[PDB]
C-alpha cells in the first residue's frame, strides 16, 4: 500500500495563468503515474500516462513532470474549460492508489445574478405542497445569499439551494433555491419574496409575486 498525496486541494486561478498541481508518492512509483481530469458526473479522462506522456487528445498546454516521488501536472495557458478535478493514480505495485484530488475553479471578475422567481404551479398546489423557486442565473463568485420573505416574515429554515458546475465558457454559476410550503401556508399569504445579495450587485435586488 503506497499512498499518493496530492497538493494543493483547491485552486481558484484566473484564465491565462499557469497552474501547478503536485502529487507525491509515499515511496517510489517509477514514473508510472497517470493524471486525470474529471468533470461533474463523468468518467475521468486521461491527461498523461507514464508520468509525462501526453494522452491522445490532450492539449499542448498540459505537461507531465516528475520523477522518483514528486510528480506534477502543469497547465500553462489555463482556459475556461480547465476547471474540474484532477487526480493522479500510481500504477506500480498493487494496490494502485488514487491521490486526494484537486478541484480547479477558473477565476473570473464579478458578475451579478439575474434573478427570477417562479410561483407554484397549480398542478403542484393541487397535490398539497407548494414550492416557490428562486433562481439566480449566471453570476460569479458562487457565494450569493437568498432570503425568502413569505409576507414579511423572514423564512429561516424551509429552503434548499443547489448550484451548477461553472460554465465552460463564461465561467459563471447559477443557483436555485426551492421554498416548500403546505398548500395551507402558501394559500394563507400573498407576497412571496426572493431577496438576493451578492458582491457584484450594488444594492440587493428582490423579486416577488402575490397569491
Amino acid at each position: 500500500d503506497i499512498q499518493m498525496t496530492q497538493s494543493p486541494a483547491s485552486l481558484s486561478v484566473s484564465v491565462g495563468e499557469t497552474v501547478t498541481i503536485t502529487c507525491r508518492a509515499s515511496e517510489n512509483i517509477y514514473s508510472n503515474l497517470a493524471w486525470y481530469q474529471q468533470k461533474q458526473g463523468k468518467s475521468p479522462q486521461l491527461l498523461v500516462y507514464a508520468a509525462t506522456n501526453l494522452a491522445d487528445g490532450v492539449p499542448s498546454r498540459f505537461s507531465g513532470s516528475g520523477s522518483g516521488t514528486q510528480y506534477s501536472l502543469k497547465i500553462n495557458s489555463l482556459q475556461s474549460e480547465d476547471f474540474g478535478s484532477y487526480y493522479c493514480q500510481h500504477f506500480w505495485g498493487t494496490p494502485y492508489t488514487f491521490g486526494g484530488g484537486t478541484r480547479l475553479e477558473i477565476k473570473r471578475a464579478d458578475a451579478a445574478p439575474t434573478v427570477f422567481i417562479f410561483p407554484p404551479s397549480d398542478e403542484q398546489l393541487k397535490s398539497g405542497t407548494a414550492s416557490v423557486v428562486c433562481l439566480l442565473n449566471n453570476f460569479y463568485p458562487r457565494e450569493a445569499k437568498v432570503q425568502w420573505k413569505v409576507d414579511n416574515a423572514l423564512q429561516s429554515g424551509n429552503s434548499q439551494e443547489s448550484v451548477t458546475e461553472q460554465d465552460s465558457k463564461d465561467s459563471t454559476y447559477s443557483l436555485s433555491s426551492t421554498l416548500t410550503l403546505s398548500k395551507a401556508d402558501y394559500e394563507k399569504h400573498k407576497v412571496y419574496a426572493c431577496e438576493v445579495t451578492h458582491q457584484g450587485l450594488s444594492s440587493p435586488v428582490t423579486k416577488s409575486f402575490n397569491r
Binding site: 468518467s43 439575474t114 423557486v133 409575486f209
Partner: protein, 212 residues
C-alpha cells in the same frame, strides 16, 4: 473503437448483493485487464481490483476482498463486479476500465437503501408576467419527489442546449429528491419555439415529456 457499456443504476436492499456488468466493445476482451474503481458522491476514487479476462488473474484492493467479486465472461466481453452484503457505505458510483491507462466506462450509480422507488412528478416553472428583469424569460421543469438518483432532463427532445441549466439533485426532508431544470430564452421568443422537457428516471421506467 473502445466503448465500455455499464449497467444502468440499481437501487438494492441492505444486506443484499448487486451485480454490475461492464460490456466491453470494440477491442479483443481477452488480453486486457478490466479495473474497477468506486467513487462516492463528493470524494476520491479508490481502486477495487482488476479481472484480466483471459489468463484469469484477479487482484483486489485488500479493503475490498470480500465485498466485491470480479468475474468475467470471455464470450460477451462482460466483466462483472458483485458487491456483497450491501450497506449504505456501498452507495457510490462504480466505474470499469481498459488497461493501466485506458478508457473509463460511464459509471453505474448504486443507491443502497431500504426505501421504495418513486418515479418523478414533473412540475412546470413559468413566470407570473414578462419583463421580470430583462428581455429574458426563464422556463423550467421541477422534477420533484423521485427516488433513487439519477434523473436526466433534456429540453426539446435534445434539440435545446443554448441556455439550459439543470441543477444537482437535492435530497429533501421526505427522503426523496427534487431538481429543477431551467432554460433562459429572450422574451421575444414566447411563441417562437414550443418548450418540452423530457424527464427520465430509468430505475422506475418513468418517461415524461412536459410542455411549458
Amino acid at each position: 473503437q473502445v466503448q465500455l457499456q455499464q449497467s444502468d443504476a440499481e437501487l438494492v436492499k441492505p444486506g443484499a448483493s448487486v451485480k454490475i456488468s461492464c460490456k466491453a466493445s470494440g477491442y479483443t476482451f481477452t488480453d486486457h485487464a478490466i479495473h474497477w474503481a468506486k467513487q462516492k458522491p463528493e470524494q476520491g476514487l479508490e481502486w477495487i481490483g482488476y479481472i484480466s479476462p483471459g489468463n484469469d488473474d484477479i487482484k483486489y484492493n485488500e479493503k475490498f476482498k470480500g465485498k466485491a467479486t470480479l468475474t468475467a465472461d470471455k464470450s460477451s466481453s462482460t466483466a462483472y463486479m458483485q458487491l456483497n452484503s450491501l450497506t449504505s457505505e456501498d452507495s457510490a458510483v462504480y466505474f470499469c476500465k481498459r488497461s493501466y491507462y485506458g478508457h473509463w466506462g460511464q459509471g453505474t450509480t448504486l443507491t443502497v437503501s431500504s426505501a421504495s422507488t418513486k418515479g418523478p412528478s414533473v412540475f412546470p416553472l413559468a413566470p407570473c408576467s414578462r419583463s421580470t428583469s430583462e428581455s429574458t424569460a426563464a422556463l423550467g421543469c421541477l422534477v420533484k419527489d423521485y427516488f433513487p438518483e439519477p434523473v436526466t432532463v433534456s429540453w426539446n427532445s435534445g434539440a435545446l442546449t443554448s441556455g439550459v441549466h439543470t441543477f444537482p439533485a437535492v435530497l429533501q426532508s421526505s427522503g426523496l429528491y427534487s431538481l429543477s431544470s431551467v432554460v433562459t430564452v429572450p422574451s421575444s421568443s414566447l411563441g417562437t419555439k414550443t418548450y418540452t422537457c423530457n424527464v427520465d428516471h430509468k430505475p422506475s421506467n418513468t418517461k415524461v415529456d412536459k410542455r411549458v
